[PDB]
Ligand binder design. Structure first.
Ligand SMILES: O=c1ccn([C@@H]2O[C@H](COP(=O)(O)OP(=O)(O)O[C@H]3OC[C@@H](O)[C@H](O)[C@H]3O)[C@@H](O)[C@H]2O)c(=O)[nH]1
Ligand SMILES: O=c1ccn([C@@H]2O[C@H](COP(=O)(O)OP(=O)(O)O[C@H]3OC[C@@H](O)[C@H](O)[C@H]3O)[C@@H](O)[C@H]2O)c(=O)[nH]1
Ligand SMILES: O=c1ccn([C@@H]2O[C@H](COP(=O)(O)OP(=O)(O)O)[C@@H](O)[C@H]2O)c(=O)[nH]1
Ligand SMILES: O=P(O)(O)OC[C@H]1O[C@H](O)[C@H](O)[C@@H](O)[C@@H]1O
Lengths: 638, 206, 309
């Protein structure tokens, strides 16, 4: 009746031609490895963004017989059947590497059926749906439109098995509809967080990983005004033939908050761009680091009493979520690191960056001024050295005549004249800071300085960049960009220049940040409550992981003070390393990057799609394999 | 003059619609005596010159500097930031021409082999690649200024802007460096010095 | 390697029809011992390699250096002139790009005013003016060499050119640096030194720049040449009758030795013509390598450094 090897894939999400969140990056970066396997059997489905789809979608006509192959005809006739009722849509190629086919449904063209479908959804599944919630209204319109379409494809395609993958509750409404209507398509649901998760961790006072198992889900969802939304996420989780999260840690929370143990993990890969020469990332690190150095000399003008050849660059970056990204542990741990490095008499220095956007009125006069004063010294030195060269040259070309007894000049006075000195001295005077002024802890004028969490915490722990501090703090409350006037680097460039990412997250279902940092060959600190950290934890024995540059802080089974101390231990362990040890560690870190590539991680998506077919069509699966394979897990199966 | 030009490009970033090869630089300088030194006549006369040049269809431009020390909190963010953006454009341009150079050189040394029918490159696409275009465009975007913003008439943040005599007079005669103005006003409320970050010239050099 | 590239551009001025990014640099070095150091096998094998590469349709180019001191009267006027001519083109190109820069900049800073409708220039004539075209054309004309003249096989005026063994061997195999030849020959009858006006490199620097040393010695009690070469992470061909060759043959299983960039030609248990063919098999094997595979081999070569310390 229906083929399991040659099967279709319909991957449905809110973000498919449409930058909203991190899911866009996942589906885009994943397209190459998916298209390679399915070619014209794969389709992404989403809601049409009328405002912005022009810039991303290559609009392709669906009526012609060259649009689809003979075996893929049913999808043409299914789209035709949708066109028969006036459902307006856009077929096309998404302008990204892989060039995957998309079906974008105009939601405005079914907004009339809103009241009917909301009512149908209410009596079917119990989901209420306020009219002022514009996003669930759209989630509902999408779900009915997509279940309709999948119903018609099931009718008209009697060769292939159909796999329907859904991402996030907003694209989840189709799932209870596919179950209740008994449509002949196997379904997957992937949640990238949980609603109750985000909301229960928002205040930053709830002991989430310990009190999770004892929460009354309906009660809390009512308390947060998201009951209707919770029910959609819950229905999608329960209705799906296979249920997945992006990490083991999120599987824990999903089980107790969505009341279903997920069938396995779908961690997010990247599309790792390799260099021809393995060592080139090391070269890049040194080039980008020289730009960081250039920034730092300006920032510390007049207070520059340390060696940049013996300085390390730590950073945190992400959304400004003081507690959930652990900017509090970061700052606390650094104040403790600073104490340990002073006590031990280390000559090293850590310059720690915080890259998290906060409301500001752009750069300070001071930041721009010190950059320009340092630049002025550079140019004046260049003039002077040009003169020096003329004098060396003349001596060199003229020896041994006119009384020149030595091959080269020996007195500095032969090379450096009064006018040269005066210039250089004047540039130096411009770099002089007022009596007692210390390099700032922030590069910008802040909208609400006195109440900023980051700055208050730096001020509380008293990291004010004094000479005797071995840890320096620089808050940069804006995303990095090569157009920036003081630190002209894009984020990826800056990361490569740094020595260590430090991301002590508390709520973080994936952890794109340490993953991207790993891909640039930069070691990093993560947590075991971060999806990246939980993924690395299981992939490598945690004392070996440090040799690969993956430090993992325990924020689940330790008190917060013990977590901070461990975070200091790792930081300090890293500072102790020599240059040769850093270079070999980065080589190990870079080698590990292959594991975060979709070539390896996309197998887990295969395992999830296998399990869906094994579950929906067990009799046909048994007889197209040697025997009965187990179907309790994605792992157990493969 | 080439140092003044470099300042002037920064100051008029995003609003740079005149030719510096057809621009003249007037200045008044000295101690801040609005009456005695004739800053009042100077500014009035400039406003009257502006009218005359527009009426007469002149294609020339006058950038008039006032260098009189007033009470200030140093350079504005805008001043410094415009100087930095122009400097970033310069360096990106210098990168791009180093690449153009390698491609011109290769064509030249290779002619007439491997299908090279012309002694020199004829199509700019041979010399300027996508990658070069992207970063030059980003530099141009950084120089862009908000809709309807005009070049300032003063380089510093003033302690008492509202009561400053020079600035009251420039407001009164309405010299706001609009594109249709042939005379531009720049008040630099401080003695010149080569340590300046925006106009790095001693007074005698200026 | 970029310094070698600069020399090569001069030496082939007016006959430059290959991509240096797809060019490999082989060399033999040592003192003028035509038989003992294997210059004869080198020049012979290269001539056959040229044939194999023309037949196989290879896009690679090998530039073979011979660095062996002979009695000479210093560099040819041609070699020196060519270098000055390339240098003069570079300075003109630099003058021209400085002008191009001011034009791009002006455009960029002025956009979108004064009728500049595109963010960048789109037409080359906006950037490259006739005065620039004239001085570039003069530099190109100066690099032009007479009809039929080929890049020389030697960089110096020889004392007794006609009776020189290396040159007579090159002439005999007919590797005259034709455009159709995928192997090129450059005899430099002097030791390398940074003060050299045409190839301003010390020997150690030049070795680092090359891709493959080729030292097919018959009598070589040790062979410092492939050892230096190996210490610098440059793969080398040697023989099982040389000290170094037998010492390395012992330390590594002979087929594994290829993966460490130690190629060993059998001159003991094979006739001279089987040996030459082996030397040619190795050269051909190496030319077929990609860049990535060259980089990996050099790493492995370099790893052996310690064993020769
Ligand atoms: O200066 C910068 C700093 C960071 N970034 C980018 O911003 C990202 C970091 O911010 P994000 O909040 O998007 O990523 P996070 O790892 O912090 O994930 C968080 O937000 C998105 C949700 O899907 C995750 O579950 C949540 O934990 C990085 O991937 C980085 O590429 C910049 O582009 N410029
Ligand atoms: O341009 C160059 C080229 C080569 N060299 C050096 O020349 C040396 C190789 O010279 P040779 O060809 O004479 O070979 P070797 O010196 O190893 O031994 C040979 O001659 C000298 C005797 O000791 C040996 O018995 C003989 O085999 C290397 O050490 C190399 O560094 C230069 O200094 N400059
Ligand atoms: O940026 C400046 C501007 C003016 N001057 C000097 O200030 C002096 C006094 O100016 P003032 O108008 O007071 O002249 P006075 O009233 O004495 O004629 C002149 O000699 C100028 O050279 C200076 O040193 N730097
Ligand atoms: O920034 P560090 O950890 O000191 O790394 C410094 C090193 O970085 C790269 O490996 C460069 O290739 C080396 O030349 C440099 O010395």
């Amino acid at each position: 009746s229906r083929d399991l090897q040659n099967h279709l894939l319909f991957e449905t999400a809110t973000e498919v031609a449409n930058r909203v969140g991190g899911i866009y990056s996942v589906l885009k970066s994943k397209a190459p490895i998916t298209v390679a396997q399915y070619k014209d059997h794969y389709h992404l489905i989403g809601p049409l963004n009328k405002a912005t789809y022009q810039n991303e979608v290559d609009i392709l006509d669906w009526k012609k017989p060259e649009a689809f192959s003979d075996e893929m005809r049913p999808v043409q006739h299914a789209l035709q059947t949708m066109e028969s009722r006036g459902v307006h849509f856009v077929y096309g190629r998404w302008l990204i590497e892989g060039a995957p086919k998309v079906i974008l449904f105009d939601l405005d063209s079914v907004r009339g059926y809103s009241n009917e479908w909301k009512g149908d959804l209410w009596s079917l599944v119990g989901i209420p749906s306020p009219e002022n919630d514009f996003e669930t209204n759209d989630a509902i319109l999408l779900g009915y439109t997509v279940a309709w379409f999948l119903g018609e494809v099931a009718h008209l395609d009697s060769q292939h098995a159909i796999v329907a993958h859904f991402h996030e509750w907003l694209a989840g409404v189709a799932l209870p509809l596919c179950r209740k209507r008994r449509i002949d398509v196997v379904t997957i649901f992937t949640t990238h967080a949980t609603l109750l998760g985000r909301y229960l961790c928002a205040s930053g006072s709830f002991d989430f990983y310990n009190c999770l198992e004892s929460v009354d889900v309906d009660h809390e969802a009512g308390r947060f005004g998201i009951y209707h939304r919770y029910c959609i996420e819950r229905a999608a989780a329960h209705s799906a033939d296979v249920f997945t999260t992006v990490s083991q840690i999120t599987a824990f929370e999903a089980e107790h908050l969505l009341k279903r143990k997920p069938d396995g993990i779908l961690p997010n890969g990247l599309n790792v761009i390799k260099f021809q020469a393995f060592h080139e990332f090391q070269n890049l690190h040194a080039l980008k680091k020289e730009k960081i150095n250039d920034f730092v000399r300006g920032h510390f003008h007049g207070c520059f009493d340390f060696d940049l050849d013996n300085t390390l660059y730590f950073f945190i970056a992400g959304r400004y979520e003081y507690k959930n990204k652990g900017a509090d542990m970061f700052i606390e741990a650094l104040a403790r690191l600073n104490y340990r490095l002073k006590v031990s008499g280390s000559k090293k220095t850590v310059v720690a960056f915080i890259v998290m956007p906060a409301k500001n009125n752009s750069f300070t006069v001071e930041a721009l001024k010190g950059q320009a004063e340092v630049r002025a010294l550079e140019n004046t030195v260049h003039e002077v050295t040009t003169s020096i060269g003329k004098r060396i040259f003349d001596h060199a070309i003229r020896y041994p005549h006119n009384g020149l007894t030595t091959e080269l000049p020996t007195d500095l006075g032969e090379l450096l004249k009064s006018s040269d000195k005066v210039m250089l001295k004047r540039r130096i005077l411009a770099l002089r800071r007022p009596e007692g002024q210390l390099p700032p802890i922030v590069t910008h004028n802040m909208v609400d300085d006195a109440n900023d969490l980051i700055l208050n915490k730096i001020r509380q722990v008293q990291l004010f960049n004094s000479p005797s501090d071995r840890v320096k703090m620089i808050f940069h409350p804006e995303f990095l960009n090569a157009n920036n006037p003081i630190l002209g680097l894009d984020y990826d460039e800056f990361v490569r220049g740094c020595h260590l990412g430090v991301f002590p997250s508390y709520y973080e279902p994936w952890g794109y940040t340490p993953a991207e940092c790993t891909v640039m060959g930069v070691p990093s600190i993560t947590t075991n409550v971060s999806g990246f950290g939980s993924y690395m934890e299981d992939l490598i024995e945690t004392n070996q992981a440090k040799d690969y540059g993956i430090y993992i802080v325990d924020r689940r089974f330790k008190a917060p003070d013990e977590s901070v101390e461990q975070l200091v231990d790792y930081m300090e362990e890293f500072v102790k390393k020599t240059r040769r040890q850093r270079i070999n560690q980065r080589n190990r870190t870079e080698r590990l990057s292959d594991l975060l590539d979709w070539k390896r991680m996309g197998l887990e998506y295969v395992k999830a799609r296998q399990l869906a077919l094994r579950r929906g069509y067990p009799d046909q699966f048994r007889e197209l394999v040697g025997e009965e394979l187990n179907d309790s897990n994605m792992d157990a199966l493969a």
